[PDB]
Amino acid sequence: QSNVLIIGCKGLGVEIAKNVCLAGVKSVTLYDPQPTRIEDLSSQYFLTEDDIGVPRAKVTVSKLAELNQYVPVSVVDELSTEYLKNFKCVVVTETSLTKQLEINDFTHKNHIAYIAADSRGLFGSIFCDFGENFICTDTDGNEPLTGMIASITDDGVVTMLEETRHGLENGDFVKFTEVKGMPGLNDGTPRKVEVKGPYTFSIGSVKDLGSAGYNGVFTQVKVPTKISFKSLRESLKDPEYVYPDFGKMMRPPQYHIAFQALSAFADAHEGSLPRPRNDIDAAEFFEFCKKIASTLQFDVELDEKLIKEISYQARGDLVAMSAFLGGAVAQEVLKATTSKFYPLKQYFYFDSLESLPSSVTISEETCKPRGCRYDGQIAVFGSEFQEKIASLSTFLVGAGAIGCEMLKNWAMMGVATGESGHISVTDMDSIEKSNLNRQFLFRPRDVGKLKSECASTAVSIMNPSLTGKITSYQERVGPESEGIFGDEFFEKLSLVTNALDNVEARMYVDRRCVFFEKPLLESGTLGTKGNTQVVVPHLTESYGSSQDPPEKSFPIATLKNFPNRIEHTIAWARDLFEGLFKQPIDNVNMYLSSPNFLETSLKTSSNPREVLENIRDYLVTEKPLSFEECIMWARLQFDKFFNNNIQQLLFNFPKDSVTSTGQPFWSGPKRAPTPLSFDIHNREHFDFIVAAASLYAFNYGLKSETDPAIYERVLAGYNPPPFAPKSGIKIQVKQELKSIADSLPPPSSLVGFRLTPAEFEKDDDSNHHIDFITAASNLRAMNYDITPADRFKTKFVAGKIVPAMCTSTAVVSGLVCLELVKLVDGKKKIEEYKNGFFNLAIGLFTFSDPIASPKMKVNGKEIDKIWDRYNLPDCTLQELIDYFQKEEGLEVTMLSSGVSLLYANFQPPKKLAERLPLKISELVEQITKKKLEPFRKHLVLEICCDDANGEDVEVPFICIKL
Ligand SMILES: CCCCCCCCCCNCCSSCc1ccc(Cl)cc1
Numbered sequence: 038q039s040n041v042l043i044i045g046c047k048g049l050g051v052e053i054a055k056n057v058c059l060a061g062v063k064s065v066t067l068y069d070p071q072p073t074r075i076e077d078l079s080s081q082y083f084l085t086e087d088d089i090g091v092p093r094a095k096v097t098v099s100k101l102a103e104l105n106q107y108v109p110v111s112v113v114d115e116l117s118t119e120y121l122k123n124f125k126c127v128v129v130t131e132t133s134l135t136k137q138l139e140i141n142d143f144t145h146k147n148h149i150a151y152i153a154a155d156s157r158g159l160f161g162s163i164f165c166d167f168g169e170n171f172i173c174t175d176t177d178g179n180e181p182l183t184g185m186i187a188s189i190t191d192d193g194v195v196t197m198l199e200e201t202r203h204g205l206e207n208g209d210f211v212k213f214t215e216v217k218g219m220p221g222l223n224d225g226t227p228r229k230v231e232v233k234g235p236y237t238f239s240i241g242s243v244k245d246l247g248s249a250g251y252n253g254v255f256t257q258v259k260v261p262t263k264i265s266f267k268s269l270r271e272s273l274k275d276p277e278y279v280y281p282d283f284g285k286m287m288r289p290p291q292y293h294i295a296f297q298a299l300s301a302f303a304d305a306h307e308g309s310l311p312r313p314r315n316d317i318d319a320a321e322f323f324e325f326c327k328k329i330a331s332t333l334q335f336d337v338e339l340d341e342k343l344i345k346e347i348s349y350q351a352r353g354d355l356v357a358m359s360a361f362l363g364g365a366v367a368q369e370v371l372k373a374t375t376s377k378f379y380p381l382k383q384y385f386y387f388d389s390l391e392s393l394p395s396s397v398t399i400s401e402e403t404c405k406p407r408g409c410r411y412d413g414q415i416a417v418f419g420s421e422f423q424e425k426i427a428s429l430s431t432f433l434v435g436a437g438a439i440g441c442e443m444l445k446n447w448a449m450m451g452v453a454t455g456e457s458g459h460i461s462v463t464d465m466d467s468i469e470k471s472n473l474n475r476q477f478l479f480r481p482r483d484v485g486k487l488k489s490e491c492a493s494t495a496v497s498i499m500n501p502s503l504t505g506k507i508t509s510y511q512e513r514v515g516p517e518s519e520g521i522f523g524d525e526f527f528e529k530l531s532l533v534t535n536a537l538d539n540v541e542a543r544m545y546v547d548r549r550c551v552f553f554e555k556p557l558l559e560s561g562t563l564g565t566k567g568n569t570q571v572v573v574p575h576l577t578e579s580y581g582s583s584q585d586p587p588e589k590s591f592p593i594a595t596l597k598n599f600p601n602r603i604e605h606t607i608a609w610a611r612d613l614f615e616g617l618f619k620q621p622i623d624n625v626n627m628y629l630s631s632p633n634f635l636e637t638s639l640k641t642s643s644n645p646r647e648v649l650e651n652i653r654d655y656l657v658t659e660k661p662l663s664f665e666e667c668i669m670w671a672r673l674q675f676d677k678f679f680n681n682n683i684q685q686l687l688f689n690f691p692k693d694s695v696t697s698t699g700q701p702f703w704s705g706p707k708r709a710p711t712p713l714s715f716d717i718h719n720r721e722h723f724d725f726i727v728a729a730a731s732l733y734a735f736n737y738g739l740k741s742e743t744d745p746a747i748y749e750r751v752l753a754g755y756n757p758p759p760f761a762p763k764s765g766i767k768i769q770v771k772q773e774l775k776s777i778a779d780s781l782p783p784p785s786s787l788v789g790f791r792l793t794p795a796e797f798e799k800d801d802d803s804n805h806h807i808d809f810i811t812a813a814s815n816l817r818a819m820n821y822d823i824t825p826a827d828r829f830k831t832k833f834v835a836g837k838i839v840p841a842m843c844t845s846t847a848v849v850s851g852l853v854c855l856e857l858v859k860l861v862d863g864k865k866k867i868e869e870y871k872n873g874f875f876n877l878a879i880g881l882f883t884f885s886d887p888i889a890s891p892k893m894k895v896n897g898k899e900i901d902k903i904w905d906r907y908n909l910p911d912c913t914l915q916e917l918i919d920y921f922q923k924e925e926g927l928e929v930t931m932l933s934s935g936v937s938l939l940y941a942n943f944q945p946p947k948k949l950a951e952r953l954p955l956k957i958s959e960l961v962e963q964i965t966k967k968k969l970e971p972f973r974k975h976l977v978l979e980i981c982c983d984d985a986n987g988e989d990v991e992v993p994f995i996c997i998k999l
């Protein structure tokens with residue numbers, strides 16, 4: 038029931054739609070009849086050069102529909118007030134405050150979620166209004182608390198075990214399962230929680246259940262709270278702020294007025310905003326602020342220098358601001374459509390004003406439109422800075438979720454467009470088939486190809502000026518000379534951006550950027566949480582670190598055919614849940630809704646035949662009348678995934694077949710499976726039937742029986758279709774669609790009839806979801822002889838394998854690029870850089886200054902313990918000693934390359950005379966008896982020094998540039 042309308046298809050609106058489609062709402066409808074201008078290609082990556090003139094919504098819908106095949110996207114050319122009732126949430130962008138009041142006054146009374154967002158230069162605002170009765174089922178990002186119990190006392194004190202999870206509140210509810218000693222406590226009815234200590238909590242007197250209870254598990258049941266939102270009209274007078282930065286606490290009240298005057302200016306100028314850095318327009322703009330500050334009886338004192346800056350940047354359109362605001366706003370849409378997180382309440386006024394360049398001229402003349410696709414960025418940073426961007430040489434590590442967002446941001450900014458510019462992208466991974474509907478740049482035609490290579494191509498279409506400027510690799514940023522990114526590669530670079538969660542890559546990328554003194558931008562995400570890190574040479578610390586810890590991933594052939602751990606069966610069970618009770622239901626509902634679904638699915642779907650077979654199987658062939666046919670369907674699924682597929686697997690590879698070597702095929706990570714025969718009196722087998730049949734009946738809206746006498750009756754006369762393993766099946770280690778379409782009932786014959794999709798939810802123990810995943814996982818584990826896991830461990834493992842969220846991924850990419858322009862400006866003051874952290878689930882945002890690098894003094898001069906070093910050519914050993922004595926006032930006492938002692942000042946001339954005239958590279962090759970590798974272009978030396986008085990002075994390492 039989560040229909041989303043999005044008003045406005047500029048840079049901001051197209052980012053929100055991208056994330057909302059990739060997040061997977063019911064449907065998205067766009068509204069933007071305005072013709073495409075040239076200045077919209079500053080942040081609108083779905084508009085090309087020869088799309089100028091056409092309405093922005095019509096050109097962008099075909100690119101949105103290609104994102105997620107289970108999210109129908111449509112366009113409206115007209116907008117009615119009553120038409121808004123077709124949507125659970127309404128997002129408004131690029132709209133005057135006049136129309137916002139007209140829209141919000143309706144949505145607030147009809148209980149329609151309202152979000153208004155605007156990207157205006159380096160300034161932005163987000164307003165949320167979810168009605169005055171909005172119910173939220175989860176007020177924090179935390180999953181419901183679970184853990185094992187030590188004991189429960191008769192007074193009601195529950196002492197928690199080694200787990201001691203985090204963290205309980207008062208008024209929460211917990212339910213108990215398998216707590217021995219108190220039988221009636223495991224019924225399922227929750228109990229109130231009063232926390233006594235960090236390991237205990239009280240549930241009330243349980244003396245009516247037993248003297249002492251032991252063991253068991255507790256699961257928190259979160260009580261839904263209600264949140265009263267004020268309308269835009271009444272919050273315009275009394276605004277409630279959410280602060281993105283407590284250091285800019287005095288700025289939201291200024292921003293609240295400036296954005297209102299920003300619309301009062303558009304009313305007086307045919308909807309146009311003030312001109313870039315225009316003093317005449319900003320003078321008129323300040324006056325508007327002065328009027329609105331008086332009528333709203335605001336006690337604030339107008340920061341004229343700050344407010345006028347909003348006018349100077351009014352018509353700026355930065356892709357970084359669209360990524361940051363767009364990801365956050367899309368997360369608010371999901372809060373409105375799932376009721377699962379705490380919304381922004383209600384005003385989120387934001388700036389990244391420190392990103393404003395200072396090494397170039399910012400004026401009317403510099404920020405004047407040029408007629409190109411970068412006008413929206415030039416309107417803020419100026420024309421001279423645009424060439425600084427265009428000549429950048431960047432190195433992006435990783436082409437997954439964050440890397441693709443990063444490349445998108447670089448293509449809209451003109452990075453590496455100019456003469457000396459170049460982009461280098463690397464990622465060893467390839468594109469697979471499972472996650473295609475969650476990928477931004479990847480489509481079904483790219484399966485098997487390299488992520489980095491396809492990402493470069495998709496970005497070169499967003500900005501054709503990047504063709505030939507991007508070089509794609511399939512390499513890890515790894516060991517030293519083996520590289521294969523050597524000294525020549527890193528010295529050309531302007532900066533490095535790390536978009537991988539890999540711990541290996543982070544270590545090397547950090548270490549390499551320190552040695553070559555190149556700026557580093559780092560980013561990572563973990564669910565709703567994310568953080569950004571900027572490393573500036575000769576300024577900040579090289580690590581910052583304390584990002585969120587990473588997560589794992591599994592090979593395709595391991596999950597599908599050769600599992601050997603219980604975590605493999607759980608992922609396989611979670612994906613199965615999606616294929617039986619989710620994706621086919623979505624295909625059916627779209628076929629009954631979108632009239633052009635037949636041709637839309639051919640271009641978008643990864644498996645257009647399975648889409649059509651889903652519609653046929655679920656609408657006619659296997660549509661159940663009663664729950665008794667749901668049990669027969671569930672019984673058929675048992676053979677289909679725990680018997681027929683295993684017979685097929687043993688058919689292609691028998692239990693005792695051999696490889697090319699002659700060794701058994703089933704050995705090591707490959708465990709020999711065994712098909713299951715259905716035992717109705719086996720707990721795992723029966724728990725699957727109940728869970729699958731009840732979930733199948735859920736899709737069709739049928740009453741799920743739980744009487745084992747009904748199951749026993751149906752399963753006795755179950756006649757399966759005779760299965761025999763097929764030959765010529767590959768197991769990994771057009772008009773035919775009209776034929777299936779002729780087997781589909783006409784959409785007109787099924788008006789109003791819909792199927793209810795199953796949205797996976799671990800926190801409700803009554804929806805049979807975890808029951809299904811536990812049973813399907815344990816049954817597959819029984820196939821391959823793997824130790825099964827109870828529903829507690831299964832629920833735990835399933836919670837830690839959720840994919841990266843596109844909302845978090847967008848927000849970091851925007852934060853990284855808002856710190857990118859600071860690096861290009863060459864900012865040298867550490868207070869102007871920001872390390873970000875956020876948690877979209879609670880509307881928390883944090884911007885902290887980077888820590889300075891630690892310093893020390895050598896002969897009264899300050900040096901950088903991290904970034905300073907002695908750069909010497911491949912001179913002789915004697916010449917190196919002379920340099921430190923004559924030019925540094927230091928007597929070198931120990932010289933080494935790694936652990937190899939190259940020189941010590943006490944060595945007799947029997948050792949030194951043969952080595953002092955040697956070049957360092959010749960001295961190194963002689964000591965440890967090894968030839969220098971061909972692309973070993975530098976030599977790192979450690980050195981111990983004494984001053985003039987014989988005391989040891991700590992000095993940096995040496996870099997021999999050979
Ligand atoms: C109840 C039905 C309501 C019907 C409303 C129909 C609106 C269609 C357009 C007609 N003129 C309204 C202009 S508002 S857009 C503000 C804006 C646009 C462009 C730029 Cl650059 C800046 C700002």
Ligand SMILES: *SCCNCCCCCCCCCC
Binds near residue numbers: 979
């Ligand atoms: S004063 C020069 C510093 N060398 C002595 C400190 C002990 C070094 C041990 C670790 C260095 C190995 C290089 C990887």
